[PDB]
Each structure stands twice: as structure tokens, then as C-alpha cells.
Amino acid sequence: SLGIDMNVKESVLCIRLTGELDHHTAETLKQKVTQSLEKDDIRHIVLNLEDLSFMDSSGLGVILGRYKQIKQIGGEMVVCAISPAVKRLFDMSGLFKIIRFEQSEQQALLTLGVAS
């Protein structure tokens, strides 16, 4: 199974995903794209998965494809909830810089490092 959560902060909508990260769970975010494609003003992203299990390269693109999509709105792309056996996905891709990840600690910078 997979969960889903959404929060707003100054303009950053935190998305708490709990479950699996696959083309199945990655889909949920897929729809969150169209919505974010044009929400209204210029909000911010704030991903954070506490229930990281499978997480394959299924949503890897769904997240990468958003990075350039989220910035297309006029904001920034943030993502946390990494791991010593999960960051290897982006560590091998070498595009981690395009995903700019952290480690919980980013909980603050997650807000987009621009908002209080």
C-alpha cells in the first residue's frame, strides 16, 4: 500500500508520502504534476517519505521529470528522506545535483531554503 499527505507553508506544499515508490505509487505524484503545473501563484515543494521501502527507478523519473516541471512554474524542487541504500539511485545516476537531496536535516531547507 501507499499513503499520501499534503501541507502548505508560506507557499511550500509538503507532500508526505508513505508506502512504496514505484510506477504505481509514482503515479500519484504524476497527477500532482498537472495540479502543480498551474496551481495559481508560485508555491514551493517539500517532499519527505518516511516509509521508504522499495523505491526503485520507477518514480525516479517521475521525480526528475518534475524537477524541471516544478521549476517551470517558477519555484524550486526539493526532496528528502534519503538513505544509505536509497541515495544509491541518484548516486549512480550522477544527476543528484539535479535532484538536490539531503537527510531529514533538510526538513528546514526542504521548505525550499527560502521561507522563514
Curated annotation (Swiss-Prot):
Which BP terms in the Gene Ontology apply to this protein? sporulation resulting in formation of a cellular spore
Q: How is it modified after translation?
A: Phosphorylated by SpoIIAB on a serine residue.
Chain ranges of the STAS domain: 2-112
**Keyword check for Phosphoprotein:** yes
In its keyword annotation, does this UniProt entry include Zinc-finger?
no
Which residues are listed as membrane-spanning?
A: none
PTM Phosphoserine: at which residues? S57
Provide the GO MF annotations for this entry.
Answer: anti-sigma factor antagonist activity; antisigma factor binding
| Assigned keywords, A-Z | Phosphoprotein, Sporulation
Superkingdom of the source? Bacteria
Q: Which SUPFAM superfamilies match?
A: SpoIIaa-like (SSF52091)
Family matches, as InterPro entries? Anti-sigma_ant (IPR003658), Anti-sigma_F_ant (IPR014237), STAS_dom (IPR002645), STAS_dom_sf (IPR036513)
Tell me which family the UniProt entry assigns to this protein: Belongs to the anti-sigma-factor antagonist family.
- Biological role stated in the UniProt entry: In the phosphorylated form it could act as an anti-anti-sigma factor that counteracts SpoIIAB and thus releases sigma f from inhibition.
**PANTHER family, alphabetized:** ANTI-SIGMA FACTOR ANTAGONIST TM_1081-RELATED (PTHR33495:SF2), ANTI-SIGMA FACTOR ANTAGONIST TM_1081-RELATED-RELATED (PTHR33495)
The entry's protein name is Anti-sigma F factor antagonist
Q: What species was this sequence derived from?
A: Bacillus subtilis (strain 168)
